[PDB]
UniProtKB/Swiss-Prot annotation, chain B:
Part of the nuclear pore complex (NPC). Forms part of the Nup160 subcomplex in the nuclear pore which is composed of NUP160, NUP133, NUP107 and Nup96; this complex plays a role in RNA export and in tethering Nup98 and NUP153 to the nucleus. Does not interact with TPR. Interacts with ZNF106. It is linked to Nephrotic syndrome 11: A form of nephrotic syndrome, a renal disease clinically characterized by severe proteinuria, resulting in complications such as hypoalbuminemia, hyperlipidemia and edema. Kidney biopsies show non-specific histologic changes such as focal segmental glomerulosclerosis and diffuse mesangial proliferation. Some affected individuals have an inherited steroid-resistant form and progress to end-stage renal failure. NPHS11 is an autosomal recessive, steroid-resistant and progressive form with onset in the first decade of life. Ovarian dysgenesis 6: A form of ovarian dysgenesis, a disorder characterized by lack of spontaneous pubertal development, primary amenorrhea, uterine hypoplasia, and hypergonadotropic hypogonadism as a result of streak gonads. ODG6 is an autosomal recessive condition. The gene is NUP107. Plays a role in the nuclear pore complex (NPC) assembly and/or maintenance. Required for the assembly of peripheral proteins into the NPC. May anchor NUP62 to the NPC. Involved in nephrogenesis. This is Nuclear pore complex protein Nup107. It comes from the Eukaryota. Belongs to the nucleoporin Nup84/Nup107 family. Ubiquitously expressed in fetal and adult tissues. It is found in: Nucleus membrane; Nucleus, Nuclear pore complex; Chromosome, Centromere, Kinetochore. It comes from Homo sapiens.
Curated annotation (Swiss-Prot), chain C:
Widely expressed in fetal and adult tissues. Expressed in the brain and kidney. The lineage of its organism: Eukaryota, Metazoa, Chordata, Craniata, Vertebrata. Forms part of the Nup160 subcomplex in the nuclear pore which is composed of NUP160, NUP133, NUP107 and Nup96. This complex plays a role in RNA export and in tethering Nup98 and NUP153 to the nucleus. The modification N6-acetyllysine is found at K291. It is found in: Nucleus, Nuclear pore complex; Chromosome, Centromere, Kinetochore. It comes from Homo sapiens. The modification Phosphoserine is found at S5, S259. This is Nuclear pore complex protein Nup133. It comes from the Eukaryota. Involved in poly(A)+ RNA transport. Involved in nephrogenesis. Belongs to the nucleoporin Nup133 family. It is linked to Nephrotic syndrome 18: A form of nephrotic syndrome, a renal disease clinically characterized by severe proteinuria, resulting in complications such as hypoalbuminemia, hyperlipidemia and edema. Kidney biopsies show non-specific histologic changes such as focal segmental glomerulosclerosis and diffuse mesangial proliferation. Some affected individuals have an inherited steroid-resistant form that progresses to end-stage renal failure. NPHS18 is an autosomal recessive, steroid-resistant progressive form with onset in the first decade of life.
Swiss-Prot record, chain D:
E3 SUMO-protein ligase which facilitates SUMO1 and SUMO2 conjugation by UBE2I. Involved in transport factor (Ran-GTP, karyopherin)-mediated protein import via the F-G repeat-containing domain which acts as a docking site for substrates. Binds single-stranded RNA (in vitro). May bind DNA. Component of the nuclear export pathway. Specific docking site for the nuclear export factor exportin-1. Inhibits EIF4E-dependent mRNA export. Sumoylates PML at 'Lys-490' which is essential for the proper assembly of PML-NB. Contains FG repeats. FG repeats are interaction sites for karyopherins (importins, exportins) and form probably an affinity gradient, guiding the transport proteins unidirectionally with their cargo through the NPC. FG repeat regions are highly flexible and lack ordered secondary structure. The overall conservation of FG repeats regarding exact sequence, spacing, and repeat unit length is limited. TPR repeats lie at residues 1-31, 117-149. This is E3 SUMO-protein ligase RanBP2. Belongs to the RanBP2 E3 ligase family. Part of the nuclear pore complex. Forms a complex with NXT1, NXF1 and RANGAP1. Forms a tight complex with RANBP1 and UBE2I. Interacts with SUMO1 but not SUMO2. Interacts with PRKN. Interacts with sumoylated RANGAP1. Interacts with CDCA8. Interacts with PML (isoform PML-4). Interacts with BICD2. Interacts with MCM3AP isoform GANP. Interacts with COX11. Interacts with synaptic plasticity regulator PANTS. It comes from Homo sapiens (Human). The gene is RANBP2. Polyubiquitinated by PRKN, which leads to proteasomal degradation.
Amino acid sequence: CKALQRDNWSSSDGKDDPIEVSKDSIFVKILQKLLKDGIQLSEYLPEVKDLLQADQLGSLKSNPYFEFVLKANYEYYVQGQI
Amino acid sequence: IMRKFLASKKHEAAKEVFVKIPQDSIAEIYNQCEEQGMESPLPAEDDNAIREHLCIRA
Amino acid sequence: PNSESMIFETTTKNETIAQEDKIKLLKAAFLQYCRKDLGHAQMVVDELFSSHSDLDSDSELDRAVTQISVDLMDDYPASDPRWAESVPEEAPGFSNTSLIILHQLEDKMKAHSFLMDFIHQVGLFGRLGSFPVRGTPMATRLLLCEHAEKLSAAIVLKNHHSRLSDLVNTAILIALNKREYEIPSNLTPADVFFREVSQVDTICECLLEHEEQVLRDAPMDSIEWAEVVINVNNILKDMLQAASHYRQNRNSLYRREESLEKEPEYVPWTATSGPGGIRTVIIRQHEIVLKVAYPQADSNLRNIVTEQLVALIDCFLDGYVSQLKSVDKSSNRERYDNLEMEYLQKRSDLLSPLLSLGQYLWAASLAEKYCDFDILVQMCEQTDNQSRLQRYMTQFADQNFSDFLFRWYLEKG
Amino acid sequence: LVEVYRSTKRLKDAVAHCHEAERNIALRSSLEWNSCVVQTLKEYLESLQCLESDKSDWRATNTDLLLAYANLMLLTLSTRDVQESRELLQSFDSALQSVKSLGGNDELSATFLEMKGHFYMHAGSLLLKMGQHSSNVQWRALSELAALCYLIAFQVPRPKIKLIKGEAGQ
């Protein structure tokens, strides 16, 4: 949650892919480290349901752009390991 | 030759060899790498040699 | 009691089934195929349309398969809550997840390809008939093709939109005014328009009503009209190429391999005759380009806008060359020879300006594709290019080009 | 000697002898020699396989083959008929069409770029050579298509070579 709150989940200028744009986020960079250090993201990560039911996220817990970009990157990085 | 003189405890003779190497030489080995004949990274004998010359100076 | 014993019911069950129920259950079967639970996706299909039923079963089948394809073209992107005040409470949509319109348009195209797989793999493609389209009957396999040609062109239109924004936003506003709809203030005109891919073509009437208006309100002493003509032509060009290129590169994935019957006169959207018909769009722009741009333009602008006009005239004649391949010369000759004369007239009406403006490569690249022997022969004498004329006297020989040329030399030549 | 190598299928030996003999300017002037070189380089490519070695030998032999085509084409334009020049240019076209797949940055990628330039120069030369004998043909159509050929053969960018400091070979 505090990694996701260091990352700027505000919307871009309407031309630009949220799986390309996410690759400078520190959350995606720690997922890329866990993958390069050998860990199964399918077992090591909390549920995308309940990472969204945690209250720590605060302002992000009302942001739909954050709600699909989080899901789109979980889908991309976990279904990339099957 | 400095690797010999420092092991032989001839620290002034190693400094005489250090003064035989002109002080521009570390930049001149980069000048000779951007005009081509070599590639954008320094030759791997000579980056290691510049690092070794900087170890010897220290 | 309760469990295995309480009557599982709630939305009625099998001994009634209305036409909403057929679509809401065929949507369940497609969603089960999108879980790869093929065993149940088939059992819902083989119940809903069981293969011992009346001849009217297939008039519901073409309809439900068409409606589910329209619902998938026009799907609401339920990841974006700008739509959370702007979606109906019953809506069995397809939940396009990507928070950008280009990726909603790609994801609709990915899902449409899986709807075509569902239609092959549960056998259904063998049953498709001719759904009513544009006030005629049209073979439903070609309507499912057209719906992905509309998606193919919407992906182009959204990529020119991300370069040419307020030209396209104004044509979108004119098109949406032609639907009389209120735009939700939580959205943009582009989000409302790129919902409705079933109607993405109406932009091509409106872009010319904006171009005609710039050609009424602006000074000819500016560059801005020349950039509008270039940019509107590139939008028409690349969309109409993305339509016919899709049609050509998937010409297997929409085809009956056998038939004992007569499929109707197929008029795709790109070949529409009418007030907003894409033929009348290409004709309006051929009037506009030749009466407004070509007189005012420089040597280089005249080339750009000629290669553009060549790409529009090519889609126009591709649209007749398709039509003259579903009308039959043996058993609808009364339609055929008269559609063939409509083609032969408009072939010369559109290409004779390329000849008269001295663009002999662009008149001829086209006339060599569509067998227009008068403008082939005229370009040869207007260049004295007897070697290219001899090349035609070889190239078109199964089609009597020499017998035609010998009239052309006898008469006036 | 190249007959006596190729009949014994000593094909790499024949090409290695060409790699020495091509240094004699008094062989590079012969149409007969350049014809033998171009055909020997094909017959060696027609013996190479899917191996990691051969992906280097095939590069040399195609750089050699395109350069030998460009010199054989210069000699054929200068010494032979118009149809003799067509069938050679159409053989050079066929040899460019294979190498055209290798979008990259090696000296076959560099040779292929320069050899588009020599191909269009020789094609423009063939159209004006056709004009020199074709008594019934209009000079405008030949000189237009030749001017297009020279415009392409001018605009092909000059090779951006790296001068090193031991290599006294031009």
